[PDB]
Write a protein that binds this ligand. Sequence first.
Ligand SMILES: Cc1cc([C@@H]2CCCN2S(C)(=O)=O)no1
Ligand SMILES: Cc1cc([C@@H]2CCCN2S(C)(=O)=O)no1
Ligand SMILES: Cc1cc([C@@H]2CCCN2S(C)(=O)=O)no1
Ligand SMILES: Cc1cc([C@H]2CCCN2S(C)(=O)=O)no1
Ligand SMILES: Cc1cc([C@H]2CCCN2S(C)(=O)=O)no1
Lengths: 348, 348, 348, 348, 348
Amino acid sequence: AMSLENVAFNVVNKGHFDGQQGEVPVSIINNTVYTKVDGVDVELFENKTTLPVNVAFELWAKRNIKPVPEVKILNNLGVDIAANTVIWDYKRDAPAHISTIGVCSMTDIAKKPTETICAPLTVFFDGRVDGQVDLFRNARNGVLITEGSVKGLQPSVGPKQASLNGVTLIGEAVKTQFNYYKKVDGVVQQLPETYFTQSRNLQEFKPRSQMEIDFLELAMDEFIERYKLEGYAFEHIVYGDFSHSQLGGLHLLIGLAKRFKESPFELEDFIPMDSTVKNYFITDAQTGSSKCVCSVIDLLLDDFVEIIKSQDLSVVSKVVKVTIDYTEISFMLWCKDGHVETFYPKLQ
Amino acid sequence: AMSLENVAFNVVNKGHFDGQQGEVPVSIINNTVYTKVDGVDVELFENKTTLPVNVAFELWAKRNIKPVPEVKILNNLGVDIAANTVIWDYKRDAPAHISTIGVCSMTDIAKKPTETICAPLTVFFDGRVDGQVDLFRNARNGVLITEGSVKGLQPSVGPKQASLNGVTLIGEAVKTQFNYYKKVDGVVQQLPETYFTQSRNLQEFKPRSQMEIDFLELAMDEFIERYKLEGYAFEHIVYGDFSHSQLGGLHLLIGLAKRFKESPFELEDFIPMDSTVKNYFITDAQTGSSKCVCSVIDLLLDDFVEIIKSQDLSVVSKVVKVTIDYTEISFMLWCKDGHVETFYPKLQ
Amino acid sequence: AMSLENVAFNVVNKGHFDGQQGEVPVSIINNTVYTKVDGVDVELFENKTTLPVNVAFELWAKRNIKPVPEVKILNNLGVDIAANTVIWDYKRDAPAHISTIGVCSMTDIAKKPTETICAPLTVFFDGRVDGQVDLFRNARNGVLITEGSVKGLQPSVGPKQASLNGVTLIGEAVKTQFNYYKKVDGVVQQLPETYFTQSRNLQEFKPRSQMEIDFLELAMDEFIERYKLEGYAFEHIVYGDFSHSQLGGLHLLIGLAKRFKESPFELEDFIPMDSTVKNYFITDAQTGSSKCVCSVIDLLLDDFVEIIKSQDLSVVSKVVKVTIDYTEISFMLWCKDGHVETFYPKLQ
Amino acid sequence: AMSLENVAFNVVNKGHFDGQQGEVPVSIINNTVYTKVDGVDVELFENKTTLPVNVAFELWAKRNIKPVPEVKILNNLGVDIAANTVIWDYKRDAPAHISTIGVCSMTDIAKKPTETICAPLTVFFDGRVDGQVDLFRNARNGVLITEGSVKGLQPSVGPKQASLNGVTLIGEAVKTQFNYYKKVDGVVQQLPETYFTQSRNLQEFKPRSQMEIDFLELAMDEFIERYKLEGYAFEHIVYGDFSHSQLGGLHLLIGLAKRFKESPFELEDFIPMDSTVKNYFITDAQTGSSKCVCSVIDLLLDDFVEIIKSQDLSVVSKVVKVTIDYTEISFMLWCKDGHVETFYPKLQ
Amino acid sequence: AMSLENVAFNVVNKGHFDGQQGEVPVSIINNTVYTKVDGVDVELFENKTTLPVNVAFELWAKRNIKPVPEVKILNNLGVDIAANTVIWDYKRDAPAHISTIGVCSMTDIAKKPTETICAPLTVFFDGRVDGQVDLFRNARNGVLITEGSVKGLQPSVGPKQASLNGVTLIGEAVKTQFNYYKKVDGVVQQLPETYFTQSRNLQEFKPRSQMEIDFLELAMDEFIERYKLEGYAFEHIVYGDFSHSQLGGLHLLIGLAKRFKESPFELEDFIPMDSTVKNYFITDAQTGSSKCVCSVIDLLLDDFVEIIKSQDLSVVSKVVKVTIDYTEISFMLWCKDGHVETFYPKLQ
Ligand SMILES: Cc1cc([C@@H]2CCCN2S(C)(=O)=O)no1
Ligand SMILES: Cc1cc([C@@H]2CCCN2S(C)(=O)=O)no1
Ligand SMILES: Cc1cc([C@@H]2CCCN2S(C)(=O)=O)no1
Ligand SMILES: Cc1cc([C@H]2CCCN2S(C)(=O)=O)no1
Ligand SMILES: Cc1cc([C@H]2CCCN2S(C)(=O)=O)no1
């Protein structure tokens, strides 16, 4: 009994699609959905997707409002479609997946993930929804998230944080750390050992360890001294070199956050999407130091120190592959006379 | 239980809105409504109105598919809104009236024509729908059409032709000639004695009398001779003067139709709408004679001959008011030495 | 002598429509109005309304730039149209009323509010404009605002605050508190006893009483102690319960403001419009506690304490009707053993 | 080396995409692709599809310009995608299939039809392109057209006509009759014995047999007499009954073509697409007889006579399934006292 | 005193911009200009240009309504801009020139053609407008048309036909044949001796000589016999070869018109604009013979016979340059044993 007016009634009365009965008058003008409220049109949704306005409106109304894995994790694990839900990508203002399974008549490829069309796709299953752990067991390809243990399956502990309505957070009143399971061609995969990105903001950055507290509170030379980081190019890589026309280093989000409290800078997100490594065209407002492609990763400073201190510093240029968010991130390690010169998440 | 998907289901399965239950997947992209048919989008409607695409789609689906009065008649009688139907204007590809009464939640000003909001508006009532002759009696303002007599109400016999799905025709299998009634401020108004325009096409023009048959067959000088029209400027007014840079006369549709079989011409409909008098920017392709505003009326040649022969030809310039389609059409009559020079439906 | 180029000249030279003579070159591309300034197009207005771009531009230029009643008050008092002005709704980026009286040729239903078309509509009259108090006296329906007394009419003192160019403020250099008068079918209404919402921001919240200062400065248990609020569920209703997956209470804007200084949260305004009670899909960023429809009202904490302390706490569930902004706001009062459990502005 | 400017260069210089090198300046404004020709923009394509303008432009440029099966045949045979070509649907002004294989980077699901993503889809293969008969053999699902025999494969002789650049024709300088083959889940399927629709126009209708020549020349009673069709309701079914408000019969295109030479009528194609059975909202302009859903099929009158004369006329109502264009078309046969009352392609 | 509402008033009341005073209510929605006529919006203009809707509307209203040179002639003579007029391109539904001189505030580069910005541009001057022959004399670059002689200036007699409101015609009531003059860098240029294209339609083709009358009446072998055209490949070039998959010849519009009366064909105008040589993707509906780029020229058959009979037939391949519409048109002449094989307006 699905309609535009019923999807709109649910948005107006329930804050999202809740399966409630009823209709409100709707008007569509270009890429915006309006509703008549006491004789005047009130905007309900502006389509920022490449889908038809009414189709994107329904998928946004039918989005998952429970803490879900962040889109970068789902992408890294090869998720193609979700089972009976919509993972809304808040960084793109669009659905995270092209098609749906049992959500919207326009985007649905199947009603149940058991349909043979879903067999070659990695379907995302949520153990919190009844019977989805059993659907993962029967699926050929898929990713499963659970809050507890699964019989016969060994889990991969995911990041502490999940996305709740576009807000990335480590839950206190809700569980956000999931057990991850994956299957390729009927075979349960052994998920690799992985670091996780911390998913922090530049403006609301909070340290998550004593090393991170010391990075933000101490001066450059005393932090490098305290943590025995001499010869590891933290001055360039983490702190950033703003002395030349091309901005040097600044590849760790904690370093950008430290810089941000002293002086502002413009970060141009030229590929706006969720990813383990982010690329920004950065312009430092104080110095005028800039970089077209400044790759930034948000690792816990302890995790970054462990990665850089676990490298052989005897090569001039070397690709260093690190598992972050279940994906292989290539870094470029440049050394000279046994000391680091630069270390950055490899661009292009 | 009104929805976009149900309006679309009715269009696809019934050819129009028929109150049938069911939904089809719909996608809206810009001003077009599409439906998924075997995996591909098929266009159902292109919005050419100034209303939101989905609202115009519903009003077009809910259009009256019975022979209805032509929009020019309804306009001439001062109709503002229709009671529980949509009069679709096929000349404008838009609803004939801004608001509705019991049709669409977005355009409705009321559910019943008895609501006090409808009292100041001239509501159109159809005696063919049950209870609408009584709704006219209750209405402060309105126009009523009927197929027979309404006890006590003095009728006006309307035009022989009506519009059935955009096709103007004099019915054979259907009744297209109605009795017309009107009320202004609770008082039944006496509709004037009127001529009716014939509503013919230039390309499919058919004569509707022996005078009209003779006009199209006989040469100019022998038709004027046979019908004693010497001194009535038919050579200028009806036939048209193509000898100078400004096209002379050509104000009767029959004259344009006669011209059309010999040589083509461009008629630019710069105000595209239904009206008793039409204005065209005409360019004769053979001679290059043209006129920016050439007013054209489609009167039966007998009715035009009766109007011109009933005039006093002793004045230089005089306004001649003639009742055509219930409205007062002003003509400009120019005479010299007791003979007509020109007679044309007056501009501005 | 109204034109798009003259409306644009006034915007460019006067900051708004001021009746000045002159024209500037204008270009319209989609929903944006541009002007040529030294060979380059400069954006003057982006249409966010459901009206044609040029019509919305003219109504926005012709908006009232004096402190006017907030749209929620006008809506609550049943205002349909304004007399010879445009009340711009800054929360919707659109005109507050569909039609105008003596403002714009496209939206005008009349030139003067004395026209019989305006008689059934509640016309808003401004006593500050010459002769508008007399127009209210002669109008069948209407709402009048004055700065002083009206002969023969008893006033209803409105809120201290008004909207000046979208900025809600209690005037110091301008008068913002008006005397309100209303007429229904020629009869001056006795406006009801009413509380007013304070119209404050979450980010710029300022206390307006010693109880409000104490709420923000004291801890939960000592404020509840000082003001004898034990058993009134302020911990749930005003302070908010962030311990479970569903956010508990948080229905008073002062409580959201207190929370906001400690930790941020996402308030999704899913029906963006001016209203006495606002609905938000709230997600607490610290805990992950969330609520799809969290109704929020901005009452002075003293006014809310007076409302809750004036209730009978012997019923399990009861609707409590309170007059706020001249409208009847239904609250849901839930009690147990003579104590409040919850009290919230009733949703749907 | 694919680009918008190269696709545009090919359209301008080759009449379509021909793999030629070069670029022309392009501008995209809304849904139209323009090119600069001597300082002025010349329209190259107007997007009437639900795809992005530049993507639809590339697929239209890359359309198959050889005689191809008509879209109704491809749909009836279950074709989902074409192998390394674009079948352009000229009835919809859009690609016949959503995705492509080796055509456009935006719509491509694969580069070669051998990719496992294509395995569940019925891929269309053209034996006229090198290596495509072998790609059919490797394909799990597919439809193959050939000009000659494929060793081992049992052929289906298809329709005489094919679509060459939107023009449906029976080839003289080109081969338009193909051998058809189909595979479902690796197994070559035996295509049924079928009738073919003739794909004729109402305005350019030409008879294709002596019975069809006699239908258009002879009067109703003498054609029915000559071909022994008494009691087969041809008067209703083929000729059409225009005496009542609902148009009776008129389900054969030849009957509509015969009617068309005497008097015009409106055929509203409310689902504009290629199909074996077409549905029209028909309004006869002469009588005013109309039908919301008038199903029309273009069978050779001999083929229709053979179908109706092969039926048992002893049942009141019966569904008659006939294979037309490889699909099963259900007809509704209504009889009384051993004679036909009506026979029509069944609706819904 | 220029405005959108005044331009709209002129269109409604004068059929075009006539400098009349007054305003009508206008609404702009997307690319369409509407006007309120008795409470409903009536479309006045649909923007098919790459200019802003209101700017294109003003230029279309301000178009030249006198017979003007066809856009192909103006392009061939290098015209960049017109002096104080708009040449409307009816083949493109857009202004023929990007900028204006004294027409529209948005498109104007100058008010008078004497401004130094116009000096490098070839300005079009009309001797029928007062003072424009003197403005040509002052102009550094320009093209001038006149009806009579200009003392001292050596004339070029132009084509007999001109475009009057989009209708190409040889005038009878108006003068359409002009004297042409041109200036490049202050120097009056001698216009070459030229042939003129006839500017005829395929559907309304009329012969303009006894050779053209004989081409359309006589069979191929007797026309070729009568006019001694043996060995000149008229069978291929003019008549067309429809026997192979690639359509042979068919480069003269008279040959396409002769073919058109026997059987229809699709002519795809892939570069829709006015030009001396037109390119079409042609598909013969009878045979299925087609050609992606079929260059077509409309020369008087006598003029084409004179061109082909004035060539040396002793070379295998040779470029033949012919002056048509003041421009140099290259033809490709292919011979064998002293006879023509093909002759076509050269592509790219
Ligand atoms: C029912 C019905 C009535 C008609 C009549 C008789 C024939 C002409 N018309 S009319 C007066 O134009 O509407 N046709 O069907
Ligand atoms: C090559 C080629 C083959 C054809 C044949 C022969 C003539 C009719 N056709 S057909 C069977 O309809 O496609 N034409 O060119
Ligand atoms: C004034 C005027 C002049 C013309 C002339 C005479 C008739 C043909 N033409 S022309 C040479 O083609 O333009 N018509 O009106
Ligand atoms: C159940 C449940 C768990 C949680 C939170 C609280 C702290 C730990 N986690 S977790 C692992 O990060 O998601 N809240 O409810
Ligand atoms: C006159 C006038 C009044 C005001 C302000 C100042 C303080 C009180 N008010 S009010 C009642 O809130 O609007 N300013 O000018």
